[PDB]
Amino acid sequence: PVDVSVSIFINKIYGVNDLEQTYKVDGYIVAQWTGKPRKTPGDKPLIVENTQIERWINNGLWVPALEFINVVGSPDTGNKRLMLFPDGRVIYNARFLGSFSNDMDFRLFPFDRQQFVLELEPFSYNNQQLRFSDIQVYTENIDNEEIDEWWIRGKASTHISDIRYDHLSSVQPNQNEFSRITVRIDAVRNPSYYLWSFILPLGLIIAASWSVFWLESFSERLQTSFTLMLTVVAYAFYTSNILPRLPYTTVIDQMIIAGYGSIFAAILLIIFAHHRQANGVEDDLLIQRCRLAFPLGFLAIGCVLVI
Amino acid sequence: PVDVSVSIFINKIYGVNDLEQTYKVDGYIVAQWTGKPRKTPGDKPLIVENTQIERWINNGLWVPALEFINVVGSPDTGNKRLMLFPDGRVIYNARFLGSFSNDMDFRLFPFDRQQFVLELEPFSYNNQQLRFSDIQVYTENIDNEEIDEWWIRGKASTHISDIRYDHLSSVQPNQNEFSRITVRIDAVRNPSYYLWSFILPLGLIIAASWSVFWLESFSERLQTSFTLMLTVVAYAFYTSNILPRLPYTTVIDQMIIAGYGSIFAAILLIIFAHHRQANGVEDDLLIQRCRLAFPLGFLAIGCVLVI
Amino acid sequence: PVDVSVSIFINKIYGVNDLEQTYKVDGYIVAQWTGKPRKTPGDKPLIVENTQIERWINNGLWVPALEFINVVGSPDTGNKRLMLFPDGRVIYNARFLGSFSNDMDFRLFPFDRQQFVLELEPFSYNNQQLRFSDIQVYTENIDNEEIDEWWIRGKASTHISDIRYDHLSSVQPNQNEFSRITVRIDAVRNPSYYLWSFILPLGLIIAASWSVFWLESFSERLQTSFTLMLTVVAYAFYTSNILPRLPYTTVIDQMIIAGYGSIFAAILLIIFAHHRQANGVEDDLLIQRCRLAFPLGFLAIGCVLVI
Amino acid sequence: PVDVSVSIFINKIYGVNDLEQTYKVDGYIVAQWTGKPRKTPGDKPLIVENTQIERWINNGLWVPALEFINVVGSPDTGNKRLMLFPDGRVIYNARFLGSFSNDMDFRLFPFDRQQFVLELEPFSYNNQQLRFSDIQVYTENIDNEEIDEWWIRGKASTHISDIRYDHLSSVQPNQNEFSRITVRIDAVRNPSYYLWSFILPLGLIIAASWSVFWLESFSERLQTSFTLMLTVVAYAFYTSNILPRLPYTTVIDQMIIAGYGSIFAAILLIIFAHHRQANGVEDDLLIQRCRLAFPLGFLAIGCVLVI
Amino acid sequence: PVDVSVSIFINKIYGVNDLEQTYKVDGYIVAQWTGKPRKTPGDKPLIVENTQIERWINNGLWVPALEFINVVGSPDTGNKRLMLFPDGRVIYNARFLGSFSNDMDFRLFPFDRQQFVLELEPFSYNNQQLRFSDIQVYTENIDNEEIDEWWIRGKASTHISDIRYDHLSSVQPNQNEFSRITVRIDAVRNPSYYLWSFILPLGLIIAASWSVFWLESFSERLQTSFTLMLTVVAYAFYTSNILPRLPYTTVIDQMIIAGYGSIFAAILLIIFAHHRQANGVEDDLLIQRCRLAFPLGFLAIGCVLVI
């Protein structure tokens, strides 16, 4: 079994696609192993670049293909090079930009946190072993973080493991285990923007809707709710267009649904206070009570949301 | 007739395009057959990868082209390999990402269910037979389902069949039958998100639209309807922007049309009650009767929609 | 002049682009002609696939290049094969997906009808003749039509013709005429969705805008129109976002312009009735007359639109 | 210096990108020159297509590379051919679809006019001269123009010129002038659609915004302006979504600003008339005077816009 | 160490992607060095174009690969040429279109300024030195600037430097320093468009929101505020749709937040003025005081934003 030392340099992780749970990874991949020694020009290690690489493979050079398991589509490899050492060492280095897949839970959207993972595996050989994996995720940790959309927490975690493929041929008596390198990078989304421009005005609108009970007439109370109703419909739009599309509801969405209910419940209480008492009494002890209680009932439901 | 065994590993099904009735399929495809035996290095099976494969084809190796019938454009093939066994067996294994077509009816959008199908066929040979197809659609069934957008119902259904092409040449006496593999995976859309954030407020708005009869004056009844009319127009927008575009009306759209109809009929009844009775009588027994009947008439019409 | 027989299988025509007047065509293309006889393996017709095809061309095989004249960008050819017959016949067969251009008039948008055309022509040879064209547009005609967006009317029409190129070199004495195959498929757009979800509510709003005259006060009449005015501005949006972008006005767009005019003319009549009569008379014989006449005047102008 | 005759056939100019000032050009490019005579099959001119072309270049055939100077990215070349004459003439013919760049001023958007230009230049040779350029822009001039988005004014203008590159090597004593072909096609945008569906209703709303002065009360005057204000805010949206994005303001945009100014100035005048006269006189000679003057003040400012 | 002279011609910088912090660069790249002399046809420098280039590399020609460090994905290279001088000089010249990454701060969006940088480095050699870098950023400086979206300030800054790579193999004793060319182009965004069509009406709306205090009744004051609230929500949409998406708040967005705050504070003050005084007094000295103070309090807060 050949010992392969790999190294993955991660320049930038960007372009998170929430609809498809993908993310782009630009960087380099390096792999080193030692083979049969070789006659080189003079005796320094030889450099073979791009199109010249396959010429050496046509003459018999063994270069194994390592596949990104969780990739989404063939990645774009930039320049690639072979470094042929006289003592037998061989170093493959290639620039790449690829889109990778992983299960991503966005339910607590403004305050959510995700991990971007890479999974590397030889495509055809199980009799070949990844000896050690070193990643260099040397993007900043204390340079730009509050300004950046994502907060990288710690240095990336590595784990070389063995995957057992059961469904295989009938000619391998026992060789159905492959070497898989798994890189994981944890990050927390910066909620600063979504708080100020989305969660804050959504709070401002929800609160001001309770000011309908400070209207004196009943006609003023019920008609105003429908203009407030329209405003909630409009603010759900301003969010949904900018906010990413999802198959599920976020925290902000729960806030929006709470809006529709607070206004509809206000419409109920406003109409309830009118026709609850006999002979047309307006139950003014309700309008003034819920004038402050209706603000309080919403705050109590919000904490059981975090139950 | 050559016996060809295929195996299709499905990693992820995503990216449903409702406008064009298409869907993306990422995974692997493996094909094995036995030909004339071959001298290999030593005698272990030889592995030939990517660019090296066509070198063997140029020297005479027969590798048939298998085409996805219902594909939409040439698929993106990642790494590909040939496993040449000394006894004559040949194993082709390749990663692919492709977009596939099938007839998809989205009319009952929030609660719809579809089946994603693959159709595989040799491009040039009918004297060559697909012997058995094993698919490994080992995406989850009981891990994330309520969280995931689609619910896979059962393991994929397979069907090897024979397609008769009539319009052909004049030189084939009887050989116009080709082997087609047809895989089918049934899935149900998770309506959770579309219910809470779209159907519920649409119900809240449609329901609250009936509270126009609880206003006392006629001027209040007719003018408020125009503000409610605007809200339904706005809510049709909020839906149409996020919801996928379709050549037909969905359930939600019928609800929207029911919204427009519920409001317009109220305007008729509101104007009807004013000028229906002689000498300016306001038919107060109608406003109060339809005060509860108008909510019920909508609920009664909704059940005949499910007729 | 070499005799070449072509056949075009059309699997699916989709993806109509109204801004650029283009549409996608997926299917197969087959071409057969007879050349000098040939020594084949044994004596069965030889099948040459994809990358192996150009190998035969390098050794002298004559395979003319056929170009889609009205294509928009080089088409995506999937698998391609050569079937080499011993008697001299040669069969080229290839799967293709291409984008094609044609003049498309969308002015009567919901109810418009178009025809998708293909134009095939040899790229370099006039001393070589297309003998007959048979198309197999065996997409359904009576399976899904009310559910499908477009209605195919009849079997596709074919026409091989001759195009005269004047601007050419100075060395051709008379050879400036090339063989062009022209296929045409006529189709009518299904307006069901645009009627129910777009044309129907647009009528409801236009009609209900006339109910402003059933308001008793003049202040009620003029102020409500501005809320109705805003509604028409909003509904032009809901259409324009979903509806395709065009360089000209459609039927629906003409409907919207009538909306702005119906509301603006009402504002004029509402203000006219106020200040037309001496000493502040409100010309009540106008408000009630146009109470039904304003609905009728719109219906009368609509028929002269179809003049 | 070799004499090269070019000819450019333009099938369709489409896909104007206003954000990046680019446009797509589908058509053909032909080039002819005479070299050393040549032995051809029999003695007819030989035709070499696509993949076969580079075979002749590897054997020594001189085929210079002509670059589109103002191209945006490598263009999509379809089929390509070489016509080799026995007397030495060589004819290269190729289909292409490319995106081209030019400086475009969109400030007068609905009524603007542009010119589409191509610039062709040899990539490596200055000792080789483009002898004459003939373009065949045989797209219609009197077929579809009012229906088409753009109006081609005249036949394309041509200009072969010499471009002096100063910053070059130190080994060329004087050879730093290259032959550039410059083709120009003038076109005027058809404003029909943008007039009816955008400029017309924008006038209707701006005009109808002035109808606030025919309201009797002061409370009616001030509150309605805010609904008109929202309507202008809404109509600015309807335009901006459909209208192209630009780094500068168009004519329609100037109309919108005049709208906000017409409404904001109205809001100022409405509050001014209330509190301008001592002891609460309502300055009724202002409301009626600007009832007609405010439409005129807007019309007076509009002509100085075309100053 | 080989001395390599590069020259970078920049035709156009466009297509800034604010989501991914990228920008497109179209232009040419030239590189010259001197090697062992060479026998050329006759003795003039030989020109080798495109596909013919690798032919010389297969025969042994040393052409180093130079990689764009801050590129995002492999760039699109148009035509490429080699100029082989007899004395040993070699000139590589190629057209390219590439997307480049750099840290870009958009927080002061309308009035922001950025610098577009390029970083060039050999892909495999440290024993080869970039001798001097000359850029020809000869895009206009005084032709169209007020019309153009970006303002280039000065001639581009260059800097060849040495980057020390630590994490390397174990066989290099001290050779871990590479030559990096760094080009920087500073530019200021033209705020003309964003000022007129976005910041101005936002001021007009924010200012006109203070006119709610000129209403006489309390019911007029509170109900109108909810109509103004909707306008700010709508105007937050009109901005967000056209304006580029960002992970943080811009100046305009801060202005939007101030809008929501100015309106909500008015709603508090409007409700505060009603119920602040004993026995239902309406505190008329506040509505009139904040009638002008609320405009001033907003202006006072705005200057501390630029603190």
Author numbering:
A (entry chain E), B (entry chain D), C (entry chain C), D (entry chain B), E (entry chain A): 11 to 317
Text taken from the publication that reported this structure:
During activation of a pentameric ligand-gated ion channel (pLGIC), the binding of agonists promotes the opening of a selective ion conduction pore at a distance of more than 50 Å away from the binding sites. Each subunit consists of a predominantly β-stranded extracellular domain and an α-helical transmembrane pore, which interact via an extended interface. Whereas ELIC forms a cation-selective channel with high conductance that is activated with high efficacy by the primary amines cysteamine, propylamine, and GABA, the cation-selective GLIC is activated by protons and inhibited by bulky positively charged compounds that also act as open channel blockers of the nAChR. Our study has identified a cluster of interacting residues located at the β1-β2 turn, the β6-β7 loop and the pre-M1 region of the extracellular domain, and the M2-M3 loop of the pore that exert a strong influence on channel function.
When mutating Thr28 in ELIC to aspartate, thereby introducing a negative charge that is present in many family members, the EC50 of channel activation shifts to a 45 times lower agonist concentration (18 μM). A similar increase in the affinity was observed in ITC experiments, where the agonist binds with a Keff of 90 μM, a 90-fold decrease in concentration compared to WT, while the binding of the antagonist acetylcholine was unchanged. Patch clamp recordings already show considerable basal activity of this mutant in the absence of ligand and increased currents upon ligand application, whereas no basal activity is observed in WT. The single channel conductance of the mutant is similar to WT, but the current density is lower in both two-electrode voltage clamp and patch clamp experiments. All experiments suggest that this mutant stabilizes a high affinity state with respect to ligand binding, and we were thus interested whether it would be sufficient to change the crystallization behavior and allow us to determine the structure of ELIC in a different conformation. While we succeeded in obtaining crystals of the T28D mutant in the same conditions, they exhibited poorer diffraction than WT and only allowed us to collect data at 4.5 Å in the absence and 9.5 Å in the presence of ligand. The structures indicate that, despite the drastic impact on the potency of the ligand, the mutant crystallized in the familiar nonconducting conformation, which further underlines the stability of this state in a crystalline environment. The role of this interaction in channel activation and the destabilization of the resting state is underlined by a mutation of the respective threonine to aspartate in ELIC, which strongly increases the potency for the agonist and where the channel shows increased basal activity, which is not observed in WT. This basal activity demonstrates that ELIC can, in principle, also open in the absence of agonist and thus underlines the validity of the MWC model also for this channel.
